[PDB]
Design a protein around this nucleic acid. Structure first.
Ligand SMILES: [Zn+2]
Lengths: 150, 183, 765, 43, 104, 146, 227, 34
RNA sequence: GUUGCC
């Protein structure tokens, strides 16, 4: 038995087919932060959604933010599910943006961002293929009995 | 509105129906006649119906090809295998009465070429006697051996069995009133 | 709580999965094997005999697996989780009763041990059948385990649902540079695998076979079947007023080349050039070996005397070979789903049980006569004391037959390898996704991307968003959520039943009008030649809706040819739909309110006539409807639920109808490799390599799929806060940056478990 | 079940001349996964 | 559509057989064969509203469906046999063939 | 897209009239195949021309398709307006059975929105019939790499 | 034009797929003779020019008779006499008949007899379908000629066939500008230096219409490494 | 060629007749025609 | 040596 902390290199997923190697682990003060103090956990660059056309993640989050604010789990099914137009109204009744796109400050320098940030919770499952049982190195090791190669 | 009552009055009689695969019904909308049966041929346990028909003479006959090759002349015979099915009742009508009877078998008559089969059985027999080139004690049934059975065994019992020479007649009124008197 | 049938048809979908679960094909075949299918095998190999000392006979009266007939207790058994960590096989012994001649008289003996069968979990011959998590808590097995898998001597395995091309039917083939053929593979249920072929060499129809020494042309083999008049030959295959007379008339003069002209001379042309397999008796008649050569061919049909129904079965097979040479549009493909036959678990291990069971009672026979070849050893000898030496040949045959996935058959001489796999306990749904998958046959068509592709005749039959990639990109497929596999029923009653509905027999009608009329094909053979089918086929459904006939029957009725089809063979794919009779459906929401009260399950709906199953063929005649707000007055078969096209392992994708279509398949390969939880007893088991996760979370947006299989009750993965933006350059393509703090608070602490084992061995000295 | 021979291992799917003589197996290597970094220069 | 082309021909099939059972009243040693459904769970051929044909051969069991349908260029002859003896009698030939179908 | 249907359905009815334009290149009844293919590959383009010009600045798919970073004027046009028509090796989704594609659609009905074309956007959603036709061209995008 | 276009130029394979040949005309207009060379080069099959073929007997005659549609020759504008058809029947080695028994009966009716077991019926029945598939005029190799128009008014002549030597020698087409595909017949006809320049112009053709551009020089090295 | 021979339906055959005349007659049935 | 998977 052994356990481990998720350091960089490991393979995270997004349940819609967006793989990712953990790039770098930074300290807590450097990320952005909203009006209430929420630090975002995991940051994705926006260079996937035009090419991969993964609009479902963009609809996962609008139904994602609205559910735990209302305190009820929400049904996103196939060929239907929780609609969008009645899901924006419960977000705006609390004070947040109507398209989920809240504003943020910068944790590095202290002021606002010139643009707004799409924001909230996404379901991230961890995946296999962690790195410490793939790190490999052989200096001067065994040779085969027949042809004497490594 | 109206009603035409029917009853079934048939037992003990296995009447059969033949099917002429050669002869059509109508020749220019007018139906022809059915030919004159010279004789018949039946074998039980295999239910064959070997019907003989005779041909027209020298006008459409070409006898010097027929005599010089097989010497079996003026006879076209044809075979039909009798098959069994359920239902298929035959009915005649009376005035406002109609009486029925079950048909037991149906045969489909195909032209059985007798003589060209018989032409080669002599050809093989003479071939043996040109160059003839030349003892039964019991055996034991073994449980690791097969014996011929099934469909070819039916051909082993359809080759040698008792023929019956039918006297072909034309009646049709004796059976007719026999149904009328029976309710 | 004002209910309607507009949006509340969904609440019967769980009633279908409550009594008829997720492992439907795996358990319901093995449960058909152990109860009914074993008595039909001892009745086909009974009465072993010895030719020496001929008054000795051993015959089998019955066979049972499990409980005795003396004690009549339930069972005495090791539990499976106590068995899966000791490298043993979960087995219960097979008991038979036998009677034989000991000596002075015959005696009967009861409850003889002969072997130890393995029993798959959640089959009714195990302890785990119908438990209520109280006995199962004692047996420390998880309630949420899917079941349906062998645990043979340690590591647990499962056989896959394999399929092949549809046996005992016909296809057509079209080739440019070689000429065109049509296959017809058939299989009698004993020792035969024969396939026939019809070839067009340089404009002439021909015929070859793997038991005839060379090719035999077509006019001979129909004159040998009785049809001799040589106008009927053209009358069957061509019809009238067409171009088929111009193509086919070349074949008729080869009868004049060989000078045959009659039904007697037609047969021995075959047997002159038959390839003689020596039966070592060989009393060949030169008339009898040809009738059997016209009997062991196209083993769909066998004959008594008249040859007739076998004759025109060849004539219909040679009609489609001249329909294709007219235009190549008449071709069929051998990857259409109607020409596929899924066949399931227990009726596939039954074939392996034959080649062991006949190997049991012949070496046991060889041990008998070796004893009975003694003069003094003839009076009071008993034969039962040497049955234990031959007993375990069944056991050790079966155990390696599941361990090493290769099956050495003898009656077919066939070597299917890779028939089982080790099931993935990496995730939860990985232990259920592999339970519903289909392995193809790999007949070396690696150049043809036809079966690599996906055909549109698949909507709801089996899943369309799930397929692996790489080594197999289109040859591993997965069942849909609502999916049932048929099984054979019978065939002689419906042949008697169709006669009642107003059809005649083939032995009455001439071929002058069968091409004018239609024709019923019972398993591909013409038996009735019906006309006006739309009166006929609608009266057939109305008997099936009332349930006088079994419901797994299809009435495919095409019009490109003048024929209608019947199917009763079993082992083909289908789903149910709700009947729509006219411009109003038969939904009748007052029935649907009585279902949520609970007194009638899904099974009562198909008893009254509100739902019936549809296979791939019966989709082609029907006009099925999506929603109740789209009913046409000419519109049947409303869709029971539209999102039932995705299997149980693709169903966890949220809103899959918005994203791009390839970005669902890339998750099905990786959902099955997700770290999460395994079972309720997951800290108890001792298996090879398991990953465990500390603080899981149920996902935020659920699906109606995942509440059917209880994915939420032991999920995989957390739901963290995501703010999509570029940051610090370390995320260029699909990288992702997460803090040092939240993983320190416990974000995704995984845990790895590994087995190691040794065995203390006792040597010779 | 066919026996391996001399001619069955000079040719073929990496018997010789691709798997041992053209392209070899070598010492002093290693293999891990990649992750980006901007802060260090090219080369 | 093509379901309507079935019923009008079966409508016209009533009249083509009602003429044939009327011309055949003169019993000139004429025959027709037709198949009755066995397996019972006698009657009377009747005429319904505007020429529709049905039989009721059961005490209650009704059989609506009857239809003259087969096209055949063959001469079929009903003949009796008896006990493998001098009993070969040609009775007559067959004009037509209808069927009987129980309605469901 | 309705006027694209309105030019299509008038063209599809001249089979009883039996007009054939007979392009040089030996059609034999596929002008009605190739003209609809040119017709439906048109309506996808000017609808993509509305989304580019009639759009404000600071649209994030607009600012990275103005550059050559990632994306194109086709990829942004299939996320907001219309996904277009699926192609299978130069073919508009041939039939599965009985001269039709799926048991939702009437017999021998050779119209787009029935064989190959899917009209609504990814932001709108997909219907159960049109989801599968996108799920076919998603397959041979993976097949050809093998 | 893709991966199955590169594969056979490197292989120099014998039986190539779709060998189109490009031959230009003499003049530019249509003139009712721009398509008159298409008749002189395509496989003019006699089943298009015959209409009604039947066997007739009087009492002792075994001869098949064929007739032609004389009003069709001017429609597709081919030019040929009647006697060259009677040449072309004995120009078929597949039918084993005598060399000269052909006798013309008028302007459009033509008959040929046969005479010598049981030869007589079989040799007039094999003959019945083996007649309406013989070439009478044009190439015995090529399949289908197609005339089209480019962005200029000039018209070319496509032929999807194999032979090239007999394409150049016929009238109505100039043998100076006749390009083609299928490299290894150009080596037989136009020396060797033409075969080197052809594989240059073909490889950068099927790389021009895939978007990328390799080099003119990276094929000029490949051009003479094979020749 | 629709060469049906009556009462056998088999075929017809062009026979080299007496003095080489072209009479038509099938085998396996005694039938002839000019 | 043989299979499974990225
Ligand atoms: Zn004859």
């Amino acid at each position: 038995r052994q356990n481990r902390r998720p350091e960089l290199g490991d393979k995270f997923s997004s349940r819609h087919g967006q793989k990712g190697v953990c790039g770098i682990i930074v300290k807590q003060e450097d990320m952005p932060f909203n009006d209430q103090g929420i630090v975002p956990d995991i940051i994705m660059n926006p260079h996937g959604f035009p090419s991969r056309m993964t609009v479902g993640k963009m609809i996962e989050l609008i139904s994602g933010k609205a559910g735990v604010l209302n305190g009820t789990l929400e049904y996103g099914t196939c060929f239907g599910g929780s609609k969008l137009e009645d899901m924006s109204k419960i977000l705006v009744d609390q004070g947040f943006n109507y398209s989920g796109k809240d504003m943020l400050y910068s944790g590095i320098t202290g002021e606002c961002l010139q643009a707004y940030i799409f924001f909230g919770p996404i379901y991230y499952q961890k995946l296999k293929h962690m790195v410490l049982d793939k790190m490999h190195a052989r200096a001067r090791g065994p040779r085969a009995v027949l042809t004497r190669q490594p | 509105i109206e009603e035409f009552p029917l009853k079934i009055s048939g037992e003990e009689e296995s009447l059969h129906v033949f099917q002429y695969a050669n002869r059509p019904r109508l020749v220019g909308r007018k139906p022809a006649e059915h030919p004159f049966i010279s004789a018949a041929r039946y074998k039980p346990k295999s239910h064959l119906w070997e019907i003989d028909i005779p041909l027209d003479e020298q006008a459409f006959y070409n006898k010097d090809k027929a005599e010089s090759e097989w010497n079996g002349v003026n006879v076209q015979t044809l075979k039909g295998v009798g098959v069994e099915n359920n239902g298929q009742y035959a009915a005649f009508v009376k005035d406002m009465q109609v009486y029925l009877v079950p048909i037991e078998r149906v045969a489909q008559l195909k032209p059985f070429f007798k003589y060209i089969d018989d032409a080669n059985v002599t050809r093989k027999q003479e071939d043996a006697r040109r160059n003839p080139n030349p003892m039964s004690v019991k055996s034991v049934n073994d449980p690791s051996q097969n014996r011929l059975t099934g469909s070819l065994l039916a051909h082993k019992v359809a080759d040698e069995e008792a023929n019956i020479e039918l006297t072909w007649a034309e009646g049709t009124f004796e059976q007719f009133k026999d149904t009328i008197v029976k309710e | 709580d004002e209910i309607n049938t507009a949006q509340d048809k969904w609440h019967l979908l769980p009633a279908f999965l409550k009594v008829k679960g997720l492992v439907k094909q795996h358990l319901d075949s093995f449960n058909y094997f152990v109860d009914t299918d074993l008595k039909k095998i001892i009745k086909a190999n009974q009465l072993i005999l010895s030719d020496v000392d001929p008054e000795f006979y051993l015959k089998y009266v019955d066979i049972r697996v499990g409980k005795k007939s003396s004690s009549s207790t339930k069972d005495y058994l090791t539990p499976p989780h106590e068995c899966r960590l000791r490298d043993m096989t979960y087995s219960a012994p097979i008991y038979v009763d036998i009677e034989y001649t000991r000596g002075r008289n015959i005696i009967m003996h009861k409850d003889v041990e002969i072997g130890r069968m393995p029993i798959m979990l959640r089959s009714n011959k195990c302890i785990l059948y119908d438990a209520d998590e109280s006995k199962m808590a004692k047996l420390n097995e998880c309630p949420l385990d899917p079941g349906g898998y062998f645990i043979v001597n340690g590591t647990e395995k499962v056989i896959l649902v394999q399929e092949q091309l549809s046996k005992n039917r016909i296809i057509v083939e079209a080739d440019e540079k070689k000429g065109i053929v049509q296959a017809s593979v058939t299989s009698s249920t004993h020792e035969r695998k024969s396939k026939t072929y019809v070839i067009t060499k340089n404009g002439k129809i021909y015929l070859k076979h793997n038991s005839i020494a060379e090719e035999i042309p077509i006019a001979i083999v129909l004159k040998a079947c009785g049809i001799l008049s040589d106008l009927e030959i053209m009358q069957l295959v061509c019809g009238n007023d067409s171009s088929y007379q111009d193509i086919f008339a070349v074949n008729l003069e080869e009868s004049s080349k060989l000078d045959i002209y009659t039904q007697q001379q037609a047969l021995e042309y075959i047997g002159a050039k038959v390839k003689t397999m020596r039966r070592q008796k060989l009393t060949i008649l030169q008339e009898g070996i040809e009738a059997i050569a016209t009997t062991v061919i196209a083993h769909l049909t066998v004959e008594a005397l008249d040859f007739r129904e076998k004759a025109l079965y060849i004539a219909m097979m040679t009609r489609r070979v001249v329909m294709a040479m007219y235009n190549p549009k008449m071709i069929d493909d051998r990857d259409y789903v109607g020409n596929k036959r899924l066949e399931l678990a227990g009726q596939l291990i039954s074939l392996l049980f034959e080649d062991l069971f006949k190997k049991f009672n012949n070496d046991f026979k060889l041990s008998i006569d070796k004893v009975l070849k003694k003069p003094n050893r003839a009076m009071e000898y008993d034969a039962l004391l040497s049955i234990n030496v031959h007993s375990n040949n069944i056991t050790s045959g079966l155990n390696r037959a599941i361990s090493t996935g290769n099956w050495s058959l003898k009656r077919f001489k066939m070597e299917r390898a890779g028939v089982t796999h080790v099931l993935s306990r990496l995730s939860y749904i990985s232990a259920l996704g592999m339970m519903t998958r289909i392995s193809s046959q790999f007949e070396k068509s690696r150049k043809v991307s036809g079966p690599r592709a996906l055909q549109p005749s698949q909507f709801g039959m089996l899943c369309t968003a799930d397929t692996p990639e790489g080594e197999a990109c289109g040859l591993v497929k997965n069942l849909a959520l609502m999916t049932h596999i048929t099984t054979d029923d019978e065939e002689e009653p419906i042949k008697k039943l169709c006669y009642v509905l107003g059809v005649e027999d083939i032995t009455l009608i001439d071929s002058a009008s069968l091409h004018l009329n239609y024709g019923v094909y019972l398993n591909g053979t013409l038996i009735g030649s019906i006309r006006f089918p739309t009166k006929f086929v609608t009266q057939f459904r109305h008997l099936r809706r009332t349930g006088k006939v079994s419901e797994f029957i299809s009435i495919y009725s095409n019009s490109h040819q003048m024929a209608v089809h019947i199917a009763t063979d079993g082992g083909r794919i289908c789903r149910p739909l709700i009947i729509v009779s006219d411009g109003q459906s038969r939904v009748k929401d007052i029935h649907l309110r009585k279902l949520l009260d609970g007194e009638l399950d899904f099974d009562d709906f198909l008893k009254l006539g509100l739902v019936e199953y549809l296979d791939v063929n019966e989709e082609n005649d029907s006009y099925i409807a999506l929603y109740e707000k789209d009913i046409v007055p000419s519109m049947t078969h409303l869709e029971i639920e539209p999102f039932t096209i995705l299997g149980a392992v693709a169903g966890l994708i949220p809103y899959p109808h918005h994203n791009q279509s390839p970005r669902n398949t890339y998750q099905c390969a990786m959902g099955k490799q997700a770290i999460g939880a395994i079972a309720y007893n997951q800290f108890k088991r001792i298996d090879t390599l398991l990953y465990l996760m500390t603080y899981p979370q149920q996902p935020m947006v659920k699906t109606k799929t995942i509440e059917l299989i209880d994915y939420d009750k032991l999920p995989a993965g957390q739901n963290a806060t995501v703010a999509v933006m570029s940051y610090s350059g370390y995320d260029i393509e699909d990288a992702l940056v997460l803090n040092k703090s939240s993983i320190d608070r416990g974000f995704g602490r995984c845990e790895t478990r590994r087995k190691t084992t040794t065995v203390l061995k006792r040597y010779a000295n | 079940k066919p026996i391996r021979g001399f001619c069955q291992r000079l040719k073929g799917k990496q018997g010789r001349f691709r798997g041992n003589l053209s392209g070899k197996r070598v010492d002093f290597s290693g293999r891990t996964v990649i992750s980006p970094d901007p802060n260090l220069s090219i080369d | 559509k093509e379901a309507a082309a079935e019923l009008e021909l079966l409508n016209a099939d009533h009249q083509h057989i009602l003429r044939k059972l009327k011309k055949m009243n003169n019993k000139p040693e004429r025959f027709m064969v037709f198949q009755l459904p066995t397996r019972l769970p006698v009657g009377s051929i009747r005429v319904h509203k505007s020429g529709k044909l049905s039989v009721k051969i059961g005490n209650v069991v009704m059989d609506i469906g009857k239809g003259a349908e087969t096209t055949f260029l063959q001469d079929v002859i009903a003949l009796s046999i008896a006990d493998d003896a001098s009993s070969a009698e040609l009775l007559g030939r067959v004009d037509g063939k209808i069927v009987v179908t129980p309605q469901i | 897209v309705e006027i694209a249907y309105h030019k299509c359905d008038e063209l599809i009815t001249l089979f009883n009239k039996g007009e054939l334009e007979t392009q040089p290149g030996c059609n034999e009844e596929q002008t009605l195949e190739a003209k609809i293919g040119g017709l439906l590959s048109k309506v996808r383009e000017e609808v993509g021309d509305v989304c580019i010009n009639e759009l404000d600045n600071w649209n994030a798919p607009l600012i990275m398709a103005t550059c050559g970073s990632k994306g194109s004027t086709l990829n942004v046009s299939q996320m907001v307006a219309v996904v277009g028509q699926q192609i299978i090796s130069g073919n508009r989704v041939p039939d599965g059975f009985q001269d039709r594609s799926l048991p939702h659609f009437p017999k021998n009905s050779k119209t787009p929105q029935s064989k190959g074309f899917v009209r609504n956007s990814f932001f709108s959603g997909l219907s159960p019939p049109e989801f599968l036709f996108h799920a076919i061209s998603g397959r041979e995008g993976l097949v050809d790499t093998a | 034009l893709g991966v199955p276009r590169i594969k056979e130029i490197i292989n120099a394979s014998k039986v190539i797929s779709t060998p189109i040949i490009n031959a230009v005309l003499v003049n530019d207009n249509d003139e009712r003779a721009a398509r008159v060379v298409k008749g002189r080069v395509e496989k003019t099959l006699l089943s298009d020019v015959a209409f009604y073929v039947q066997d007739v007997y009087k009492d002792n005659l075994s001869f098949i008779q064929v007739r032609i549609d004389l009003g069709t020759i001017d429609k597709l504008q081919l030019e040929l006499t009647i006697e060259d058809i009677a040449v072309a029947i004995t120009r078929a080695s597949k039918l084993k008949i005598q060399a000269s028994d052909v006798n013309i009966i008028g302007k459009d009716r033509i008959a040929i007899n046969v005479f010598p077991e049981n030869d007589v019926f079989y040799r007039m029945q094999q003959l019945r379908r083996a007649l309406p598939d013989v070439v009478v005029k044009g190439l015995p190799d090529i399949s289908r000629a197609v005339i089209n128009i480019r962005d200029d008014g000039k018209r070319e002549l496509l032929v999807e066939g194999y032979g090239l030597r007999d394409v150049m020698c016929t009238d109505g087409v100039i043998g100076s500008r006749t390009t083609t595909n299928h490299v290894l017949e150009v080596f037989s006809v136009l020396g060797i230096e033409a075969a080197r320049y052809s594989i240059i112009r073909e490889i950068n053709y099927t790389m021009s219409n895939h978007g990328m551009s390799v080099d003119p020089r990276h094929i000029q090295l490949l051009g003479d490494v094979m020749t | 060629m629709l060469s049906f021979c009556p009462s056998c339906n088999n075929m017809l055959l062009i026979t080299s007749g007496d003095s080489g005349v072209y009479t038509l007659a099938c085998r396996s049935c005694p039938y002839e025609f000019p």
